Design a protein around this motif. Structure first.
Motif, PDB file in Angstrom:
ATOM      1  N   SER A 108      -4.465 -12.693  -0.564  1.00 41.43           N
ATOM      2  CA  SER A 108      -3.363 -11.959   0.050  1.00 41.43           C
ATOM      3  C   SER A 108      -2.332 -12.905   0.647  1.00 41.43           C
ATOM      4  CB  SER A 108      -3.899 -11.015   1.119  1.00 41.43           C
ATOM      5  OG  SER A 108      -2.839 -10.436   1.855  1.00 41.43           O
ATOM      6  N   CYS A 109      -2.793 -13.977   1.295  1.00 43.78           N
ATOM      7  CA  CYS A 109      -1.865 -14.947   1.873  1.00 43.78           C
ATOM      8  C   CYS A 109      -1.035 -15.639   0.803  1.00 43.78           C
ATOM      9  CB  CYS A 109      -2.622 -15.973   2.706  1.00 43.78           C
ATOM     10  SG  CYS A 109      -2.946 -15.404   4.362  1.00 43.78           S
ATOM     11  N   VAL A 110      -1.659 -16.021  -0.311  1.00 45.00           N
ATOM     12  CA  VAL A 110      -0.910 -16.634  -1.406  1.00 45.00           C
ATOM     13  C   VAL A 110       0.147 -15.670  -1.925  1.00 45.00           C
ATOM     14  CG1 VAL A 110      -1.120 -17.291  -3.819  1.00 45.00           C
ATOM     15  CG2 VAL A 110      -2.591 -18.346  -2.125  1.00 45.00           C
ATOM     16  N   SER A 111      -0.223 -14.397  -2.076  1.00 43.70           N
ATOM     17  CA  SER A 111       0.724 -13.403  -2.571  1.00 43.70           C
ATOM     18  C   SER A 111       1.908 -13.246  -1.625  1.00 43.70           C
ATOM     19  CB  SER A 111       0.013 -12.068  -2.770  1.00 43.70           C
ATOM     20  OG  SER A 111       0.915 -11.078  -3.223  1.00 43.70           O
ATOM     21  N   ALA A 112       1.633 -13.137  -0.323  1.00 44.87           N
ATOM     22  CA  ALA A 112       2.710 -12.970   0.650  1.00 44.87           C
ATOM     23  C   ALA A 112       3.607 -14.195   0.690  1.00 44.87           C
ATOM     24  CB  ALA A 112       2.133 -12.682   2.033  1.00 44.87           C
TER      25      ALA A 112
ATOM     26  N   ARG B 114       4.225 -16.315  -1.812  1.00 43.78           N
ATOM     27  CA  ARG B 114       5.072 -16.308  -2.999  1.00 43.78           C
ATOM     28  C   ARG B 114       6.184 -15.277  -2.876  1.00 43.78           C
ATOM     29  NH1 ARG B 114       0.135 -16.588  -7.416  1.00 43.78           N
ATOM     30  NH2 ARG B 114       0.452 -18.769  -8.030  1.00 43.78           N
ATOM     31  N   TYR B 115       5.863 -14.089  -2.362  1.00 42.33           N
ATOM     32  CA  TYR B 115       6.887 -13.065  -2.202  1.00 42.33           C
ATOM     33  C   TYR B 115       7.986 -13.531  -1.263  1.00 42.33           C
ATOM     34  CZ  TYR B 115       9.262  -9.209   0.010  1.00 42.33           C
ATOM     35  OH  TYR B 115      10.220  -8.390   0.550  1.00 42.33           O
ATOM     36  N   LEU B 116       7.611 -14.122  -0.128  1.00 43.15           N
ATOM     37  CA  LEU B 116       8.627 -14.596   0.804  1.00 43.15           C
ATOM     38  C   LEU B 116       9.482 -15.680   0.167  1.00 43.15           C
ATOM     39  CD1 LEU B 116       6.626 -14.645   4.124  1.00 43.15           C
ATOM     40  CD2 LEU B 116       8.724 -13.388   3.729  1.00 43.15           C
TER      41      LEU B 116
ATOM     42  N   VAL C 122      -1.701  -5.585   0.672  1.00 40.39           N
ATOM     43  CA  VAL C 122      -0.631  -6.540   0.937  1.00 40.39           C
ATOM     44  C   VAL C 122      -0.320  -7.347  -0.315  1.00 40.39           C
ATOM     45  CG1 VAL C 122      -0.107  -8.661   2.167  1.00 40.39           C
ATOM     46  CG2 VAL C 122      -0.892  -6.670   3.418  1.00 40.39           C
ATOM     47  N   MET C 123      -1.356  -7.769  -1.041  1.00 36.24           N
ATOM     48  CA  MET C 123      -1.161  -8.563  -2.248  1.00 36.24           C
ATOM     49  C   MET C 123      -0.401  -7.780  -3.312  1.00 36.24           C
ATOM     50  SD  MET C 123      -4.193 -10.310  -4.412  1.00 36.24           S
ATOM     51  CE  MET C 123      -4.011 -10.969  -6.061  1.00 36.24           C
ATOM     52  N   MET C 124      -0.783  -6.520  -3.525  1.00 33.12           N
ATOM     53  CA  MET C 124      -0.111  -5.692  -4.518  1.00 33.12           C
ATOM     54  C   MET C 124       1.341  -5.437  -4.137  1.00 33.12           C
ATOM     55  SD  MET C 124      -0.743  -4.363  -7.454  1.00 33.12           S
ATOM     56  CE  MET C 124       0.921  -4.785  -7.962  1.00 33.12           C
ATOM     57  N   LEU C 125       1.598  -5.104  -2.866  1.00 27.57           N
ATOM     58  CA  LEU C 125       2.974  -4.874  -2.434  1.00 27.57           C
ATOM     59  C   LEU C 125       3.811  -6.137  -2.548  1.00 27.57           C
ATOM     60  CD1 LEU C 125       2.735  -2.518   0.642  1.00 27.57           C
ATOM     61  CD2 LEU C 125       3.571  -2.019  -1.656  1.00 27.57           C
ATOM     62  N   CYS C 126       3.242  -7.286  -2.184  1.00 26.61           N
ATOM     63  CA  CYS C 126       3.989  -8.534  -2.251  1.00 26.61           C
ATOM     64  C   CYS C 126       4.327  -8.898  -3.687  1.00 26.61           C
ATOM     65  CB  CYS C 126       3.200  -9.648  -1.573  1.00 26.61           C
ATOM     66  SG  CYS C 126       3.133  -9.495   0.216  1.00 26.61           S
ATOM     67  N   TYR C 127       3.392  -8.692  -4.616  1.00 19.98           N
ATOM     68  CA  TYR C 127       3.691  -9.007  -6.009  1.00 19.98           C
ATOM     69  C   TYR C 127       4.684  -8.017  -6.608  1.00 19.98           C
ATOM     70  CZ  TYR C 127       0.497 -12.875  -6.493  1.00 19.98           C
ATOM     71  OH  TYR C 127      -0.117 -14.098  -6.386  1.00 19.98           O
ATOM     72  N   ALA C 128       4.604  -6.743  -6.217  1.00 16.32           N
ATOM     73  CA  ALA C 128       5.601  -5.781  -6.673  1.00 16.32           C
ATOM     74  C   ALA C 128       6.986  -6.132  -6.144  1.00 16.32           C
ATOM     75  CB  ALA C 128       5.203  -4.370  -6.248  1.00 16.32           C
ATOM     76  N   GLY C 129       7.070  -6.532  -4.875  1.00 14.17           N
ATOM     77  CA  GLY C 129       8.339  -6.980  -4.335  1.00 14.17           C
ATOM     78  C   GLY C 129       8.848  -8.238  -5.005  1.00 14.17           C
ATOM     79  N   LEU C 130       7.941  -9.138  -5.386  1.00 13.37           N
ATOM     80  CA  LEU C 130       8.341 -10.335  -6.115  1.00 13.37           C
ATOM     81  C   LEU C 130       8.925  -9.982  -7.477  1.00 13.37           C
ATOM     82  CD1 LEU C 130       6.542 -13.671  -6.077  1.00 13.37           C
ATOM     83  CD2 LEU C 130       7.131 -12.725  -8.284  1.00 13.37           C
ATOM     84  N   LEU C 131       8.298  -9.048  -8.189  1.00 14.28           N
ATOM     85  CA  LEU C 131       8.804  -8.652  -9.497  1.00 14.28           C
ATOM     86  C   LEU C 131      10.045  -7.773  -9.406  1.00 14.28           C
ATOM     87  N   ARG C 132      10.313  -7.173  -8.246  1.00 11.45           N
ATOM     88  CA  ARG C 132      11.543  -6.414  -8.060  1.00 11.45           C
ATOM     89  C   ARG C 132      12.674  -7.239  -7.468  1.00 11.45           C
ATOM     90  N   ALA C 133      12.370  -8.385  -6.857  1.00  4.58           N
ATOM     91  CA  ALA C 133      13.412  -9.225  -6.283  1.00  4.58           C
ATOM     92  C   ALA C 133      14.180  -9.982  -7.353  1.00  4.58           C
ATOM     93  CB  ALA C 133      12.809 -10.203  -5.278  1.00  4.58           C
ATOM     94  N   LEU C 134      13.501 -10.401  -8.417  1.00  6.77           N
ATOM     95  CA  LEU C 134      14.152 -11.087  -9.522  1.00  6.77           C
ATOM     96  C   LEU C 134      14.688 -10.122 -10.571  1.00  6.77           C
ATOM     97  CD1 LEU C 134      11.947 -11.269 -12.169  1.00  6.77           C
ATOM     98  CD2 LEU C 134      10.912 -12.919 -10.633  1.00  6.77           C
TER      99      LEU C 134
END
Lengths: 338, 52, 281, 231, 238
Positions: free
Chosen positions: C97-101, C103-105, C185-197
């Motif tokens: 989860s920390c790695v995901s957050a 990367r998202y940030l 948290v991991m799923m939300l962070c990766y979804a936000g990462l794929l929606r930010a780009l």
């Protein structure tokens, strides 16, 4: 007319070529072919000096063989105690695009300069405890690529404009201006007696200048591309140049000719820093492929490698007492070798 | 404007040049004379170099 | 019982045969990039360390399961072994989860992250996570963990059935705060990462799709490993908190196979975060 | 450079008194500072030390819990808060400036000092010739001796020489037994061997009359020696 | 172990290191840009407007501070250097982006601008450095195309066979001729950019006038994108 002058120049150039060719009776490799090889030279990283934020472009040893100044694109000079790795001074510069630095032989001043076209001079030993800008030398119309101190009041600067200068530091003025290059002058080396100096420029030529008289004595032309580094043999009768054609060459002043070239097929990156050892038996050369090579200066055999840098080697300096070699690179670390 | 180039080339031509063999021999002689006082060439024992 | 004589034995054998060298390689890779100012490397290093701890604690459980659920190593030792195993099992999810957050940030706020001494804050967060998980699994450590049963098993650190609503609430909390909080948290962070780009002019379709596979599919691997175990745990805890001895007798081999499939996320982590990453390999 | 300190006066025994040292003309925040005192007719004696960055504070054993040293870099002043002043604190307190890096010269500047009066295993350094007669034009050889060798494994011997004219505060003459301080004429030179040291004045002039103190900096506390009086 | 003066020297070094960390924070929170262009390109006007809106005779480099949404930017243009560039351009291989201003309304110096852009794009040290090209002086281009006295087809023969791309977005309401011309110039530059990028760096076109106040925002957006992609590479996401 212009055609007549050009024809005269061509005739004189052919005459100089013939004069050089006549004096060439035995290449240095033939006469060195019966001396013992240096053998493998292993050098180990003794100290790693950390603290620079960005890439390091220049360094210079003190004449006491212990203090050391380094310049980085973050906009600082740092004076290191090489024995203990302590930081003695941290000098913030006005322009961050610094790409040369020098340490005065007396030890009282340091100089730096770069894309600001100014050779700034710093007073290390003041009654106040800080380092202050003693004087800013302005007058070059291009970037300052090298600066070397003759004494505490004279300094020699090579610049991006095809021009070197000798300055008086008390009265800023340029005492002598050396003209004759056609491209950017990249390096500079003072002779041991500080009466002559050689500059290598981007016209693929190096010239020996006379500081007092102000005129070019000789012109050496062997390289195929621009010359990035230059250093005198400790004798004062020879110098070595490092170019972007991935070769180093050793010229002689007295014979006025190229003696030996230091090249290898595996090496295709350009040499960016060149320095000798105390005996001159070793020619240390930096490279863009992240490593420094140690050439047997008499036989043109690569004797060693100084491979510990994660980016290109930008500067290289052998100490006055011959104990150490320092190497600064674009990974923002210096390394003291032995 | 090339008169300066011609004059400088002339002043560069009329100099004394020694043979290349004498030059190389002198360079070799310096290297062999100052061979013992060269820590990089012949490494100093690891109780006298200040980077032990 | 009966299937714990073969199946979790063989999964544990495969883990101890491959993950341990793999986790060592991942640990070396993670340490190598800690040197380069990176603050993903500290999370990766702690993840590999936790995986190595769990892998080295695995083979007492290998003997445990392959000897028809018997404990003979001593009432004191099963406390430590269960503590290490069940703490690494949750610390792994926390650090994913920390790695995901992280990367998202870094991707969504590139001009504002990380900036200010990134190794220090990440190390502080890692230590705080270790402390919180250790505190969470301390109450199980306070235990009468070794249990003697009539039917010739003598488990340790486990009980069938559970004990008086207490372990049941503890298990429900363990599920809902060591999984689906870090996984959510991991799923939300990766979804936000794929929606930010979605809007970047520089990323082509070829290199958008591989980011899509990673972002939607690394959480899928984590869920597919850690999911059946916690679903079964929550099912037992809810049934005891709404069945008799029939229900547990029915989902027992499911429970001890889901544990092995959950510890199988010690091959995936080194693989998916070292070999799948071009930089590490 | 100048250092002006104040806050001295008649203090009843058992009282308290703060001394401040106002600095001007140099980079105060990068200089370590010391307090050095001398009794009305005796030699110098080290009191306290505060580092640049306030990260190292040392006191003499005779004032260990009594005094406290502090500095105020933005206001550029140095303090010495003192409590429970006994009668052995009648002295003139000097504010000394010291910077430490490779090649630096510590103790190079001393303030003018404040007088304070109160109503009714450390290295020893000895300077035996406690008086010398001398005449203008000839060569003197003030001597000193140590209990522990001042030579370190670095190669330095931490011996310092100070000169105190009959009026103003001491001014550094030699640091680390061989280096003449900035502004001192080449008439002065120093030598020694690790335990025994000497200071030579080559062609004595009428401005060299005073008291010559030595000092060790090998380890805290810093000890001085009574000093030889040139007359 | 080590003497008192050595301890104090170590402590001085540690304080220097603390100041260095304080400087590191501000160094990595500011983005360095390099501004390039010719005499005709209004890069002087761009820098003057950026300086005015937001926040020494032979000097060789000029610096400009400007800030967009609490993010600091450093923009350097070279003042006194010679014509040659191959030596001092190596100092700028870690900048966030290069801003290349071109006069889009000249037609007689446009091929020189394309050659300069090609030299910047294919430079050995400027790989992994993105270029924010500002096709400047769009209003002069509009006036010149509407006047009709000066034609493009004679300077660039291929312009006749060229047609406006479907992805065109001529916003304010303008004749199709000025749109066709300006997209033709942009496409020339972008052909140079996409010929040999290899995916390591990108090119961000923008149609600008020197009066425009939205240039700092455009730079901020492009730099945000560049750092996003660089982070994607750093965090092992691609």
């Amino acid at each position: 007319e212009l055609d007549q002058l050009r024809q005269e120049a061509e005739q004189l150039k052919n005459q100089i070529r013939d004069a050089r060719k006549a004096c060439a009776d035995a290449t240095l490799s033939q006469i060195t072919n019966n001396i013992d090889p240096v053998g493998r030279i292993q050098m180990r990283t003794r100290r790693t000096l950390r603290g620079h934020l960005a890439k390091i472009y220049a360094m210079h040893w003190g004449t006491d063989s212990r203090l050391l100044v380094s310049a980085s694109q973050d906009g600082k000079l740092i004076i290191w105690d090489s024995y203990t790795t302590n930081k003695v001074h941290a000098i913030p510069l006005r322009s961050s695009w610094v790409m040369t630095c020098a340490y005065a032989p007396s030890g009282n001043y340091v100089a730096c300069g770069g894309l600001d076209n100014i050779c700034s001079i710093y007073n290390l030993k003041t009654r106040e405890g800080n380092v202050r800008v003693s004087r800013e030398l302005a007058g070059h119309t291009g970037y300052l690529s090298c600066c070397r101190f003759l004494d505490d009041n004279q300094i020699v600067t090579s610049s991006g404009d095809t021009t070197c200068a000798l300055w008086d530091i008390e009265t800023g003025q340029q005492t002598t201006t050396f003209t004759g290059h056609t491209g950017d002058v990249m390096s500079l080396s003072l002779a041991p007696d500080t009466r002559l100096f050689v500059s290598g420029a981007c016209d693929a030529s190096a010239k020996l200048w006379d500081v007092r008289e102000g005129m070019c004595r000789q012109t050496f032309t062997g390289h195929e591309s621009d010359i990035n580094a230059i250093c005198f043999f400790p004798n004062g009768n020879a110098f070595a140049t490092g170019s972007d054609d991935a070769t180093c060459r050793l010229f002689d002043l007295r014979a006025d000719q190229e003696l030996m070239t230091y090249s290898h097929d595996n090496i295709i990156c350009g040499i960016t820093s060149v320095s000798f050892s105390k005996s001159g038996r070793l020619l240390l050369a930096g490279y863009d492929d992240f490593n420094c090579n140690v050439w047997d200066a008499l036989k043109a055999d690569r004797a060693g490698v100084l491979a510990g840098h994660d980016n290109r080697v930008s500067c290289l300096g052998v100490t006055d007492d011959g104990m150490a070699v320092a190497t600064g690179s674009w990974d923002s670390f210096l390394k003291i070798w032995n | 404007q090339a008169r300066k180039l011609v004059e400088q080339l002339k002043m560069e031509a009329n100099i004394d040049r020694i043979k290349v063999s004498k030059a190389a021999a002198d360079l070799m002689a310096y290297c062999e004379a100052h061979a013992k006082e060269d820590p990089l060439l012949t490494p100093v024992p690891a109780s006298e170099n200040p980077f032990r | 019982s009966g299937l714990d004589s073969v199946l979790p034995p063989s999964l544990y054998a495969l883990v101890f045969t491959l993950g341990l060298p793999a986790n060592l390689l991942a640990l070396w890779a993670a340490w190598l990039q800690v040197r380069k100012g990176r603050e993903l490397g500290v999370y990766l290093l702690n993840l590999s360390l936790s995986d190595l701890l769990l892998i080295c604690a695995l083979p007492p459980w290998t003997d445990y399961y392959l000897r028809r659920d018997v404990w003979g190593y001593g009432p004191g030792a099963c406390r430590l072994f269960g503590f290490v195993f069940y703490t690494n099992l949750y610390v792994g999810a926390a650090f994913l989860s920390c790695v995901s957050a992280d990367r998202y940030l870094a991707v969504a706020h590139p001009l504002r992250f990380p900036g200010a001494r990134p190794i220090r804050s990440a190390a502080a967060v890692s230590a705080l996570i270790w402390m919180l998980e250790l505190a969470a699994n301390a109450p199980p450590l306070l235990a009468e963990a070794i249990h003697r049963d009539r039917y010739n098993h003598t488990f340790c650190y486990e009980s069938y059935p559970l004990s008086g609503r207490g372990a049941a609430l503890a298990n429900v909390g363990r599920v809902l705060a060591g999984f689906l909080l870090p996984w959510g948290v991991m799923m939300l962070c990766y979804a936000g990462l794929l929606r930010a780009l979605r809007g970047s002019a520089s990323c082509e379709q070829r290199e958008r799709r591989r980011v899509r596979r990673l972002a939607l599919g690394l959480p899928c691997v984590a869920l597919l490993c850690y999911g059946p175990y916690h679903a079964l745990l929550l099912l037992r805890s809810l049934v005891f908190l709404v069945g008799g001895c029939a229900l547990e007798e029915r989902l027992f081999p499911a429970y001890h196979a889901s544990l092995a499939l959950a510890t199988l996320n010690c091959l995936a982590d080194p693989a998916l975060y070292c070999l799948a990453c071009p930089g590490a390999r | 450079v100048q250092l002006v300190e104040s806050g001295g006066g008649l203090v009843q025994p058992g009282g308290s008194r703060k001394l401040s040292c106002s600095a001007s003309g140099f980079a105060f925040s990068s200089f370590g500072m010391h307090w050095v005192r001398q009794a009305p007719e005796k030699g110098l004696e080290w009191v306290a030390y505060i580092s640049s960055g306030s990260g190292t504070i040392y006191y003499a054993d005779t004032v260990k819990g009594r005094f406290t040293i502090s500095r105020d870099d933005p206001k550029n002043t140095l303090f010495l808060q003192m409590t429970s002043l006994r009668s052995e604190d009648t002295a003139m307190y000097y504010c000394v400036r010291s910077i430490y890096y490779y090649g630096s010269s510590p103790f190079d500047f001393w303030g003018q000092g404040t007088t304070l009066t109160v109503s009714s295993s450390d290295i020893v350094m000895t300077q035996a010739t406690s008086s010398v007669p001398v005449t203008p034009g000839e060569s003197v050889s003030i001597s000193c001796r140590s209990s522990k060798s001042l030579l370190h494994s670095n190669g330095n011997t931490y011996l310092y020489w100070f000169l105190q004219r009959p009026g103003q505060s001491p001014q550094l003459l030699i640091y680390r037994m061989s280096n003449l301080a900035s502004g001192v004429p080449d008439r002065f030179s120093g030598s020694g061997s690790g335990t025994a040291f000497t200071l030579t004045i080559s062609r004595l002039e009428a401005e060299d009359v005073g008291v010559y103190y030595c000092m060790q900096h090998l380890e805290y506390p810093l000890t001085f020696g009574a000093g030889t009086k040139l007359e | 172990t080590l003497s008192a003066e050595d301890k104090a020297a170590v402590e001085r070094s540690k304080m220097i290191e603390k100041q260095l960390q304080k400087d590191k924070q501000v160094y990595r929170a500011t983005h360095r840009l390099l501004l390039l262009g010719a005499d005709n390109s209004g890069k002087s006007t761009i820098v003057k407007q950026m300086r005015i809106y937001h926040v020494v005779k032979t000097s060789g480099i000029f610096e400009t501070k400007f800030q967009v949404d609490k993010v600091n930017f450093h923009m350097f243009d070279v003042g006194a250097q010679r014509d040659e560039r191959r030596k001092w351009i190596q100092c700028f291989n870690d900048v966030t982006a290069i801003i290349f201003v071109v006069d889009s309304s000249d037609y007689a110096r446009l091929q020189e601008a394309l050659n300069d852009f090609k030299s910047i794009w294919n430079n050995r040290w400027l790989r992994t450095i993105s270029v924010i090209l500002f096709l400047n002086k769009q209003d002069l281009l509009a006036e010149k195309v509407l006047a009709g006295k000066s034609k493009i087809e004679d300077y660039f023969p291929e312009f006749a066979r060229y047609t406006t791309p479907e992805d065109a977005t001529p916003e304010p309401g303008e004749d199709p001729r000025v749109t066709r011309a300006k997209y033709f110039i942009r496409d020339e530059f972008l052909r140079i950019s996409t010929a040999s990028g290899d995916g390591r760096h990108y090119c961000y076109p923008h149609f600008t006038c020197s009066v425009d106040t939205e240039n700092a925002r455009r730079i901020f957006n492009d730099c945000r994108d560049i750092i996003q992609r660089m982070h994607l590479r750093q965090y092992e996401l691609l």
